[PDB]
Design a protein around this ligand. Structure first.
Ligand SMILES: CC(C)CCC[C@@H](C)[C@H]1CC[C@H]2[C@@H]3CC=C4C[C@@H](O)CC[C@]4(C)[C@H]3CC[C@]12C
Ligand SMILES: CC(C)CCC[C@@H](C)[C@H]1CC[C@H]2[C@@H]3CC=C4C[C@@H](O)CC[C@]4(C)[C@H]3CC[C@]12C
Ligand SMILES: CC(C)CCC[C@@H](C)[C@H]1CC[C@H]2[C@@H]3CC=C4C[C@@H](O)CC[C@]4(C)[C@H]3CC[C@]12C
Ligand SMILES: CCCCCCCC/C=C\CCCCCCCC(=O)OC[C@@H](O)CO
Ligand SMILES: CCCCCCCC/C=C\CCCCCCCC(=O)OC[C@H](O)CO
Ligand SMILES: CCCCCCCC/C=C\CCCCCCCC(=O)OC[C@H](O)CO
Ligand SMILES: CCCCCCCC/C=C\CCCCCCCC(=O)OC[C@H](O)CO
Ligand SMILES: CCCCCCCC/C=C\CCCCCCCC(=O)OC[C@H](O)CO
Ligand SMILES: CCCCCCCC/C=C\CCCCCCCC(=O)OC[C@H](O)CO
Ligand SMILES: Nc1nc(NCCc2ccc(O)cc2)nc2nc(-c3ccco3)nn12
Ligand SMILES: CCCCCCCC/C=C\CCCCCCCC(=O)O
Ligand SMILES: CCCCCCCC/C=C\CCCCCCCC(=O)O
Ligand SMILES: CCCCCCCC/C=C\CCCCCCCC(=O)O
Ligand SMILES: CCCCCCCC/C=C\CCCCCCCC(=O)O
Ligand SMILES: CCCCCCCC/C=C\CCCCCCCC(=O)O
Ligand SMILES: CCCCCCCC/C=C\CCCCCCCC(=O)O
Ligand SMILES: CCCCCCCC/C=C\CCCCCCCC(=O)O
Ligand SMILES: CCCCCCCC/C=C\CCCCCCCC(=O)O
Ligand SMILES: CCCCCCCC/C=C\CCCCCCCC(=O)O
Ligand SMILES: CCCCCCCC/C=C\CCCCCCCC(=O)O
Ligand SMILES: CCCCCCCC/C=C\CCCCCCCC(=O)O
Ligand code: NA
Length: 391
């Protein structure tokens, strides 16, 4: 006996087709927004586009291939291997794009004055092409001989009535589990995911250190200003001015040049007076500094804080994407670890296998939602496309 397999199969196929439709629609919208709006045309979004192209291919190719391989149909083993492994190419390309985004945002926060010269559109395109080539090589490695085509399941192949050179096309009969666990999961997925966690940690720490340094320079300027006011010795005001000059030159190195020239000029004026013994003439000259800091230094410090907060909010938005990739793909990899490392364990049931596959495919739908919710420039362009082109 047993429930007709077509019943559970019809649920699985319908759900896969629903995911395919949404993965295509949302990611086409991402590509159309970057094409239309020049504000979205930057190196970071070229990797966003490469990632959207990989998710479009999940809907157009990997999902029809997943439906085909679920039937266990008779096929030449290398044809079967191509259908089984093509999704691993798209997943590897997604990992390289995510890793590129992380390093791009790290270079922007650590060396912003050298960013536009080091990270160019031409260099990004070249990196995108190399990454797509490497993804085909990694994902299709079983086709080079690391496969179970040489050890066919004779009982399964006669039961389904396959011909000569043909196998019943089932993922776990043709793709070796040692490839899936050691090579694909540990080396190609887990290692870059941990590298990305490291890069994001370094982004947040760099921003936190840069923000604390800005605030320190600001309080150093205001503290020593009060030290000059409540002083009595010419060398006492001379020490507070020398400590202000250092904090002023460090704030400049982190219309703009005009405001700092007035400030450093005024410090140098009040310094020459203090060095000549004129303490009261120095203290009155230092009282003028309060007008310069309120008219130029407070505005520059506020704009530098706002830019850094924007980079932190943008780094968090992109980290959510890496987190959702990990959440959607880890169950399938973890199930494979149990199949491989625990031979005394019952194999995970069929319904759980197909639920883990469906969840990994759901990852190809989620990114356009993160862009729409967390990035204003994508959100506004999405609204323009829908309100005018669709409506
Ligand atoms: C460019 C896009 C639109 C076309 C993609 C081509 C796809 C559909 C082609 C290319 C290679 C093909 C496979 C090559 C070999 C075999 C072995 C055979 O025993 C059954 C069919 C099967 C498994 C083919 C199925 C279709 C296939 C996967
Ligand atoms: C739109 C343009 C650019 C792409 C056209 C792609 C063509 C070449 C693809 C799309 C679907 C493909 C077919 C899908 C299924 C099968 C059954 C298999 O047993 C042999 C190959 C065969 C018959 C494929 C041959 C090539 C095919 C017809
Ligand atoms: C949030 C995500 C990353 C964590 C989810 C982990 C999932 C994939 C884990 C948690 C508990 C796990 C199951 C625990 C028990 C068994 C029994 C064994 O005979 C086969 C594997 C199987 C069925 C495990 C498969 C993977 C499993 C379902
Ligand atoms: C079907 C298989 C793969 C999907 C092909 C999708 C490829 C389409 C991506 C190219 C594009 O038009 O994006 C816009 C940017 O180029 C703007 O600069
Ligand atoms: C670009 C399009 C490439 C499409 C080329 C499709 C090549 C099809 C190859 C094929 O179908 O081979 C089946 C084989 O004969 C069964 O044993
Ligand atoms: C690095 C990328 C270069 C990838 C090029 C590697 C060439 C692969 C060789 C090949 O085409 O494989 C034959 C096929 O496996 C027959 O069974
Ligand atoms: C076999 C192919 C493996 C490629 C795995 C991908 C990236 C690893 C990045 C390199 C790790 C070095 C960081 C130290
Ligand atoms: C929200 C996003 C959450 C992430 C989804 C994570 C895992 C898939 C869900 C698995 C649910 C656990 C039930 C599977 C199970 O334990 O049953 C197998 C049984 O033990 C075998 O005999
Ligand atoms: C992130 C959480 C870390 C580890 C999972 C918790 C540790 C669970 C320890 C594994 C249980 C175990 O070893 O039992 C299986 C045994 O082989 C039966 O045959
Ligand atoms: N283990 C596995 N199985 C399948 N499909 C076959 C599901 C199945 C498993 C056992 C069985 O007897 C019949 C069907 N797709 C799979 N995709 C992946 C994968 C992709 C990326 C990481 O893991 N692993 N994986
Ligand atoms: C996304 C969350 C929606 C949940 C949809 C449930 C998905 C899959 C249910 C699994 C059905 C069992 C598949 C039958 C296996 C077979 O093809 O023979
Ligand atoms: C979405 C509608 C597609 C209909 C699928 C039912 C056919 C089937 O699963 O066998
Ligand atoms: C999930 C997918 C979101 C679908 C948004 C619908 C917009 C259609 C625009 C288009 O894809 O051309
Ligand atoms: C079906 C294939 C999907 C190709 C769609 C790519 C769209 C690119 C674009 O928006 O300019
Ligand atoms: C299979 C899908 C792979 C096909 C094409 C990859 C598209 C990558 C997008 C490149 C965008 C970069 C740019 O426009 O400068
Ligand atoms: C195209 C989109 C969906 C259809 C997927 C093709 C399914 C073919 C299964 C092959 C078979 O019947 O054995
Ligand atoms: C874009 C071009 C459209 C692609 C055309 C191919 C469409 C559907 C392929 C359906 C697969 C047919 C499987 C039948 C196998 C069988 O008869 O046993
Ligand atoms: C590029 C797209 C398809 C080319 C793949 C070559 C077909 C490999 C299958 C070989 C076979 O088993 O007959
Ligand atoms: C920009 C588009 C990307 C084009 C890159 C494609 C180049 C393919 C490179 C390596 C593939 C290696 C896997 C071997 C495939 C075996 C083919 C076969 O005989 O079936
Ligand atoms: C890194 C993890 C090393 C794997 C341990 C191998 C244990 C075994 O299967 O014999
Ligand atoms: C299958 C679809 C799975 C996941 C995508 C869910 C995204 C929709 C959430 C938006 C809900 C809302 O309007 O607040
Ligand atoms: Na992806």
């Amino acid at each position: 006996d047993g429930a007709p397999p077509i019943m559970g199969s019809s649920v699985y196929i319908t759900v896969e087709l629903a995911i395919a439709v949404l993965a295509i629609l949302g990611n086409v919208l991402v590509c159309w927004a970057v094409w239309l709006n020049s504000n979205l045309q930057n190196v970071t979004n070229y990797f966003v586009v490469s990632l959207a192209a990989a998710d479009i291919a999940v809907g157009v190719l990997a999902i029809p291939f997943a439906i085909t391989i679920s039937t266990g149909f008779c096929a030449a083993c290398h044809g079967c291997l191509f259908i089984a492994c093509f999704v691993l190419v798209l997943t590897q390309s997604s990992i390289f794009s995510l890793l590129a985004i992380a390093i791009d945002r790290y270079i922007a926060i650590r060396i912003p004055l050298r960013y536009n010269g080091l990270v160019t559109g031409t260099r990004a395109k070249g990196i995108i092409a190399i990454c797509w080539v490497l993804s085909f090589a990694i994902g299709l490695t079983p086709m080079l001989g690391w496969n179970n085509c040489g050890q066919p399941k004779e009982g399964k192949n006669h039961s389904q009535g396959c011909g000569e050179g043909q196998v019943a096309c089932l993922f776990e009969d043709v793709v070796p589990m040692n490839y899936m666990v050691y090579f694909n999961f540990f080396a190609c997925v887990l290692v870059p995911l941990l590298l990305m966690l490291g890069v994001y940690l370094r982004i947040f720490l760099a921003a936190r250190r840069q923000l604390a340094d800005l605030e320190d320079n600001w309080e150093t300027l205001n503290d020593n200003l009060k030290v000059i006011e409540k002083a009595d010795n010419a060398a006492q005001v001379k020490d507070a001015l020398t400590k202000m000059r250092a904090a002023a030159l460090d704030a400049q190195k982190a219309d703009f040049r005009h405001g700092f020239d007035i400030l450093v000029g005024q410090i140098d004026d009040a310094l020459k007076l203090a060095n000549e013994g004129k303490v009261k003439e120095a203290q009155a000259a230092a009282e003028q500094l309060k007008t310069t800091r309120n008219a130029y230094i407070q505005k520059y410090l506020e704009r530098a804080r706002s830019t850094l907060q924007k980079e932190v909010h943008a780094a968090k938005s992109l980290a959510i994407i890496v987190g959702l990739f990990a959440l959607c793909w880890l169950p399938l990899h973890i199930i494979n670890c149990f199949t491989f490392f625990c031979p005394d364990c019952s194999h995970a049931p069929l319904w759980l296998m197909y639920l883990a596959i469906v969840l990994s495919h759901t990852n190809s739908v989620v990114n356009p939602f993160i862009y729409a919710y967390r990035i204003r420039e994508f959100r506004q362009t999405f609204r323009k496309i829908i309100r005018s082109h669709v409506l």
